[PDB]
């Protein structure tokens, strides 16, 4: 394995991650309806949880990537020549199956990266982050070159352009995966493992439960429907959550530098750090309830989402890096991997529970009156 093949493998893994998260990033960017995001998250978490326990075949990854591509094609054709009711029904079922397929693809790619030397999990995560950044950048570039016709609440030209970009990325990732990857071929009981590393599980569910509680439907959906935020400004608001969330997962990794010495601190301090994250709930609600000019400001709205974005990824990698320090009775190498399975499961429950509790705020009269 010389430098050329290693570089190609790193590139194809980064590209697999990028093309897997492209669909979610463009669904966020296009201001799609909230229930579609909820369906996508539900499908993704269900598929990931199911695939964690079942050793699904590793040959099927290109097939489901092609299924994702044809689903994007169906999205385009439905936005083109389908009426509102059939478009809604399609888009919802397509988003459910898209979430399922994306979760399966992520699981298969991570399993491929793990069972090989010079792991590519870091490369896949970097690919996901670059997917978020790339979607934001192309959306910003595309905003001033597309007329906002707003056919079904989604810009026709923007949807077509973003989805053809996603399709070309998906097919070129397909060819990269086919060319590069080879698709031929005494432990303690779980109760003791759970009762020992319970803080790490709880500290990871809480951060993902709260972040996905707000950003989907209250992070920018309720702000724009209560303050009439322009579509140009919404892209900056939503698109800067996905550029600071990716940038926030690195500083924990470069702990050797003096500046980032205190970024990974402890597990006990993480619970009290997630309690301070609960102070984001009044701030997000206050941004959609007061007309006083400071709250109706693009920079404040951007910064308020930026702070949540930074504390999301930074608090999502810390429990992975410090939970081994807090372990007392789980000492074997096999239990370390088993506990890590509980952590990723605890996140998907956090994402699944995060989206659905957004409907709690529907009871409150948060949104300002139209006149």
């Amino acid at each position, epitope marked *: 394995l010389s430098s050329k093949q290693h570089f190609m493998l790193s590139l194809t893994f980064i590209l697999i991650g990028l093309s897997s998260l492209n669909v979610w990033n463009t669904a966020l960017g296009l201001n799609i309806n909230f229930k579609y995001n909820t369906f996508q998250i539900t499908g993704l978490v269900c598929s990931s949880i199911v695939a964690l326990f079942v050793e699904i075949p590793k040959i099927m990854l290109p097939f489901l990537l092609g299924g994702l591509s044809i689903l994007c094609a169906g999205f385009q054709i439905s936005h083109s020549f389908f009426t509102d009711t059939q478009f809604d029904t399609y888009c919802l079922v397509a988003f459910i199956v898209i979430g399922v397929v994306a979760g399966l693809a992520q699981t298969i790619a*991570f399993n491929i*990266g*793990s069972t090989m030397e010079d*792991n590519m*999990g*870091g490369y*896949m*995560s*970097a690919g*996901i*982050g670059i997917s978020g950044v790339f979607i934001f950048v192309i959306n910003l570039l595309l905003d001033q070159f597309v007329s906002p016709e707003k056919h079904y609440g989604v810009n026709k030209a923007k949807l077509l352009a973003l989805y053809i970009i996603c399709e070309l990325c998906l097919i070129l990732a397909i060819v990269f995966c086919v060319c590069n990857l080879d698709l031929t071929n005494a432990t303690l009981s779980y109760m003791e493992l759970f009762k020992d590393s319970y803080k790490a599980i709880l500290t990871m569910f809480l951060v993902n439960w709260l972040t996905l509680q707000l950003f989907p439907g209250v992070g920018h959906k309720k702000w724009q429907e209560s303050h009439n935020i322009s579509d140009y400004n919404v892209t900056i608001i939503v698109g800067m959550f996905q550029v600071f969330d990716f940038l926030s*997962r*690195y500083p924990p*990794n470069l*702990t*050797h530098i003096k500046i980032f010495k205190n970024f990974t601190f402890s597990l006990n301090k993480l619970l009290v750090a997630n309690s301070l994250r609960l102070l984001f709930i009044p701030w997000f609600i206050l941004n959609a309830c007061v007309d006083h000019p400071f709250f109706k400001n693009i920079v404040q709205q951007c910064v308020c989402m930026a702070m949540l974005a930074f504390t999301n*990824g930074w608090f*999502n*990698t810390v429990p*992975f*890096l410090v939970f*081994v*320090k*807090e*372990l*007392k009775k*789980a*000492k*074997k*190498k096999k239990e*370390i*991997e088993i506990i*890590s399975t509980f*952590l*990723v499961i605890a*996140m998907f429950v956090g994402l699944f529970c995060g989206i659905w509790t957004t409907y709690i705020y529907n009871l409150f009269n948060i949104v300002l009156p139209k006149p």
Partner: nanobody, 123 residues
Framework: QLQLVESGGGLVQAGGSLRLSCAASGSTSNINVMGWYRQAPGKQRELVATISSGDALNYANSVEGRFTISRDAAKNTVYLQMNSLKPEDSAVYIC?????????????????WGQGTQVTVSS
């Protein structure tokens, strides 16, 4: 890359005592648990003793009460003390590291092995 340096092996009489030093240079803080593995000639690899980052002590059932392994987080060096050596422990001990690569939403672990030292006891 990640490099491991081991020293202390040799030929000593039965019931002796040796101190094995293992140090890491490439990865500084991502190491979670370091340990020692022995491989007898004509035999498969086996675990000897591992110390985690949170001072968690693991041992093989055949070395309990005889081997003491200590860590020095200041320079990322792990030392193993062997007491009352016996002929069946004649093997090659290779230091091992356990690095977590967890850039987010997925934790993956790697094993880094040094060249190891040959320890033989006879007479």
């Amino acid at each position: 890359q990640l490099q491991l340096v081991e020293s202390g092996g040799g030929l000593v009489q039965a019931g002796g005592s040796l101190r094995l030093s293992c140090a890491a240079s490439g990865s500084t803080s991502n190491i979670n648990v370091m340990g020692w593995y022995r491989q007898a000639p004509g035999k498969q690899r086996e675990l000897v003793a591992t110390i985690s980052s949170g001072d968690a002590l693991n041992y093989a059932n055949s070395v309990e009460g005889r081997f003491t392994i200590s860590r020095d987080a200041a320079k990322n060096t792990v030392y193993l003390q062997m007491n009352s050596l016996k002929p069946e422990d004649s093997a090659v001990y290779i230091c091992n590291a356990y690095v977590v690569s967890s850039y987010g939403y997925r934790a993956s672990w790697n094993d880094y092995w040094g060249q190891g030292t040959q320890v033989t006891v006879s007479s």
